[PDB]
């Protein structure tokens, strides 16, 4: 998370709790200690275009709030100004060469606001934008050629964009298009012509719409390029001559190189193991660098040189796991006949007897997808002979908006059905038998893991949960604390409508704990959180033990009892180590899991 900003040809990074300017020799612009903060970590650095000032925002743990500190970038590394609670900021070079800082903070929870800080003649904080609606978030973005500073007013379903001239920082912002509910727009400039990324008209289809910078209304927009329906745009990298569009769909990645000054589109060939895209913020201006990664392979560097056909792998580092592990894309068939993508990872020199411990990962909530970034512990499990699988199930977002809508408020059980289908499908393919199956889930995904434990316990041997959202019904029916509308729409309100109360009762894993055989379950939980009360987990743990205890008393006759383990913490490696030891003990695998990280 270490912030790195390169400008003026010298990079600026935070080291030793002090703002540092690097050409092993560095110059300290500021000492973060003076701010009287504990463990202050720099989240954002923005360097004035003419290097007179540098601004950065500094945050500490256990604080929602952070402060933006402005240092003179002059030979004097002294403080110029500071401003608390700044969400974002950016610099614009005035026509008088005055580097003015635009920044966004919030006047209480009432509204957010954009101010322009002038230092050279002491004009300080002039207001350029004021907010009216607390549900929207104001964020600043300047494009690459600094033609237009953009004020982005955003929500998840809709956005509004206002432009501030990069050649006239004092002018009032100009609205491109008044907000339309359900429509989000992102704006980039090429040559007194704008390209707009938008889902106007059709919510499930993002498209490239072009228009003159002086003719911003929707009615004047033409069509430049369209993406496949329900694909996810992760990024759009604008250049003078072309743009590079980065897309994801399902479990496939695509890169589209689209000429703008030359209307011809080019698709790039990506390797089959890539499961996600890492974007660079080096903003190099005559190349489009990016990295590809997978949960079992550290990020690799690729660069597209708009100039030549292809010179992508400039990186000299490569990992043999590319050839020693295989990435299968195998969909499962649901109870209602739908296809549920699943990503499966296994060794290519694996034995004919494909009956090895299988780890299944599920989230299935809030429209989120499963993060595919590299995790050394997951790779080790594969090196030891583990088969990993990721289930892209209803309630998440990999296949479109309807995937979030389904497997949700009145239909959560569909996410459960998709998880069940995935597990049975893997067993059906023959990767593992139930005795070697392991399931893992986090926070919201714990609902699905819990519910599966109650409905089909014979499918899993051991389950590993982190701070799971288990007692859904009491958490949701807690009228004392108002339920956030966001959640209220991710879990029906049982306090206002009996059908939600009944639907939730039907899937809530706490409520449905019943005397029967269970998988061994290890729970990692924390002392202090807001989303997952510890008392919920403790009650679950106590009730779960009682159910299996009653089961064991009537039918056990010497049979072993599933190990129910609750580990409370106020370190990631310690957590991982404990989880691996738990699973290996349950799976009777022993331990040679030695690694460098």
UniProtKB/Swiss-Prot annotation:
The chain holds residues 111 to 720 of 727 of the full protein. Signal peptide: none annotated. It is found in: Cytoplasm, Cytosol; Golgi apparatus, trans-Golgi network; Cytoplasm, Cytoskeleton; Golgi apparatus. The active site is at residues 443, 529. The gene is PREPL. It is linked to Hypotonia-cystinuria syndrome: Characterized generalized hypotonia at birth, nephrolithiasis, growth hormone deficiency, minor facial dysmorphism, failure to thrive, followed by hyperphagia and rapid weight gain in late childhood. Myasthenic syndrome, congenital, 22: A form of congenital myasthenic syndrome, a group of disorders characterized by failure of neuromuscular transmission, including pre-synaptic, synaptic, and post-synaptic disorders that are not of autoimmune origin. Clinical features include easy fatigability and muscle weakness. CMS22 is an autosomal recessive form characterized by neonatal hypotonia. Its EC number is 3.4.21.-. This is Prolyl endopeptidase-like. One of its GO terms (cellular component) is cytoskeleton. It comes from Homo sapiens. Belongs to the peptidase S9A family.
């Amino acid at each position: 998370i270490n912030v790195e900003v390169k400008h003026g040809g010298f990079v600026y990074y935070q080291e030793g709790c002090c703002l540092v300017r690097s050409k092993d020799n560095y110059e300290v612009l500021f000492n973060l200690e003076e701010l009287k903060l504990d463990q202050p970590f720099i989240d954002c650095i923005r360097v004035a275009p003419d290097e007179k000032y540098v601004a950065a925002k500094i945050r500490t743990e256990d604080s929602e709030a952070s402060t933006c500190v402005i240092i003179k970038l002059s030979d004097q590394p002294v403080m110029e100004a500071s401003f608390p609670n700044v969400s974002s900021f950016e610099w614009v070079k005035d026509e008088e060469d005055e580097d003015v800082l635009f920044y966004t903070f919030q006047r209480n929870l009432r509204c957010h606001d954009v101010y322009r800080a002038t230092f050279g003649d002491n004009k300080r904080n002039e207001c350029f934008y004021t907010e009216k609606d607390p549900s929207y978030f104001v964020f600043l973005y300047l494009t690459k050629d600094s033609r237009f500073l953009t004020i982005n007013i955003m929500n998840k379903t809709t956005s509004e964009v206002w432009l501030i001239d990069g050649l006239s920082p004092w002018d009032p912002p100009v609205l491109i298009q008044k907000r339309i509910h359900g429509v989000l727009y992102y704006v980039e400039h090429r040559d007194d012509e704008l390209y707009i990324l938008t889902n106007v008209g059709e919510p499930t289809e993002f498209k490239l719409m072009r228009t003159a910078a002086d003719t911003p209304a929707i009615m004047n927009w033409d069509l430049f390029f369209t993406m496949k329906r329900n694909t996810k745009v992760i990024d759009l990298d604008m250049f003078k001559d072309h743009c590079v569009l980065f897309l994801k769909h399902s479990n496939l990645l695509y890169v589209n190189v689209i000429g703008l000054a030359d209307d011809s589109v080019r698709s790039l060939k990506l390797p089959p193991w890539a499961c996600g895209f890492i974007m660079d913020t080096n903003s190099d201006p005559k190349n489009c660098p990016f990295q590809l990664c997978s949960p079992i392979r550290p990020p690799k560097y690729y660069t597209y040189k708009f100039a030549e056909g292809k010179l992508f792998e400039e990186t000299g580092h490569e990992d043999p796991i590319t050839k020693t592990s295989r990435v299968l894309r195998l969909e499962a068939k649901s109870k209602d006949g739908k296809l549920v993508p699943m990503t499966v990872f296994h060794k290519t020199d694996s034995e004919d007897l494909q009956k090895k411990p299988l780890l299944v990962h599920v989230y299935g909530a809030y429209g989120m997808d499963l993060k595919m970034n590299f995790r050394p512990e997951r790779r080790v499990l594969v090196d030891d002979g583990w088969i990993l699988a990721y289930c892209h199930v209803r309630g998440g977002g990999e296949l479109g908006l309807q995937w979030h809508a389904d497997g949700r408020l009145t239909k959560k059980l569909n996410g459960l059905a998709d998880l069940e289908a995935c597990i049975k499908t893997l067993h059906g393919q023959g990767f593992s038998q139930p005795s070697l199956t392991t399931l893992t889930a986090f926070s919201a995904g714990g609902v699905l893991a819990g519910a599966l434990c109650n409905s089909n316990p014979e499918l899993v041997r051991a389950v590993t949960l982190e701070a799971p959202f288990l007692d859904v019904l009491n958490t949701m029916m807690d009228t004392t604390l108002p339920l956030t509308l966001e959640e209220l729409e991710e879990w029906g309100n049982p306090s206002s409508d009996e059908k939600h109360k009944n639907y939730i009762k039907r899937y809530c894993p706490y409520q449905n704990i019943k005397p029967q055989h269970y998988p061994s379950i290890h729970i990692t939980a924390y002392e202090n959180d807001e989303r997952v009360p510890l008392k919920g987990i403790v009650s679950y743990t106590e009730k779960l033990k009682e159910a299996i205890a009653e089961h064991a008393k009537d039918t056990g006759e010497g049979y072993q009892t599933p190990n129910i383990i609750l580990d409370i913490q106020p370190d990631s490696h310690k957590k991982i180590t404990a989880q691996i030891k738990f699973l290996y003990e349950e799976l009777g695998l022993d331990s040679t899991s030695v690694f460098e990280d």
